[model samples]
Structures are given as C-alpha cells and as structure tokens.
Target: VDMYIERAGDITWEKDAEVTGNSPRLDVALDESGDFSLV
Candidate 1:
C-alpha cells in the first residue's frame, strides 16, 4: 500500500485539491466512452 499512500500524498499537495480549509472535494464525472474525468 506504499504506492497508494504515495499517490495520495501527491494529490494532497496539488493546489486544485484544496476545497475548503484543508478539506477537499473532487469533482468527478464519467463519460459515455467509459472514461472518467476529475476536476
């Protein structure tokens, strides 16, 4: 699970990951082509 935690750490440092007061809410969507998007 080290890789998973490492990835999560990377996400935490992303500026867009900030939502409110250190808490984040990722806006995700699924497309008709079966692909996922995150904003």
Candidate 2:
C-alpha cells in the first residue's frame, strides 16, 4: 500500500481522514487498467 501511494497521484489527505486522524485514510482506489473503487 505504501508503494502504491508513492506511484499514485495526489491523494486528498484531509478529505479521507477520519475524526481521530489516522492513515490508511483512503476512500478510493484505482489501477493501471483503469479500475476504480469507492470505500
């Protein structure tokens, strides 16, 4: 996951952050073949 983030585009940290402010704070995902998912 760490490696993936490094290659992915700018992630909106604040937007995905939980109230306690921890990470893995993601709400979306995408792949090289153009697949996407919402969490």
Candidate 3:
C-alpha cells in the first residue's frame, strides 16, 4: 500500500524504509518513481 503523511502537505509520504538493526528507528528510502509524488 502507499504510505502518506497528511500534516506535511501533498508531498508528505513514506517512500520506503529499511531495518538496520532491532530498532524501528533504522529506516531509509529513495522513492524515485514517485507513485505518490503528487506530480
């Protein structure tokens, strides 16, 4: 599903995330496709 943030405006969305360890804080993304980029 497409993740999005409603407080940051139309550009607010979760591009992607990755787990580095056993913590939820370890996350990263690079949404170049912008399926939800709102272009």
Candidate 4:
C-alpha cells in the first residue's frame, strides 16, 4: 500500500506509523499490482 500525507502544499510519501494533524485528508492507495488477497 502507498501511504502519504500532504501539508502546506507539499507531498510526503513516508510518514511515521502514528501521525497527528490538525484535521486534514491523508493519502492511501493500493500497491502497484492493486491486488488484495484474503484467506
């Protein structure tokens, strides 16, 4: 999965597992293959 965050007109693709913000949208997307498997 691709996780990112945007702030002050900048883009960051890597952030700590625990994040905090004043209240904004976060970014997320499927992996390159865009596949999900469940067992």
Clashing pairs in 1: none
lDDT by residue for model 1 (1-39), tens:
455433334334565674756666889899999998996
Clashes of each: 0, 0, 0, 0
Name the better of 3 and 4 by lDDT: 4
Compare the candidates by TM-score and give the number of the best one: 1
Q: Which stretches of candidate 4 lie over 4 Å from their true place?
A: 1-31
TM-score for each model: 0.30, 0.26, 0.17, 0.16
lDDT string for model 3 (1-39, tens) is 799756645655566765465544434554778543322
Cα lDDT of all candidates, in order? 0.70, 0.70, 0.54, 0.63
Clashing residue pairs for model 4: none
Minimal lDDT window, size 10, model 3: 21-30
- lDDT by residue for model 4 over 1-39, one digit each (tens)? 699876666556765677766974646556669864432
Off by over 4 Å in 1: 1-25
Candidate 3, RMSD to the unseen true structure:
14.3
The C-alpha local distance difference test score for the whole of candidate 3 amounts to: 0.54
Q: After superposition, how far is residue 30 of candidate 3 from its true place, in Å?
A: 1.8
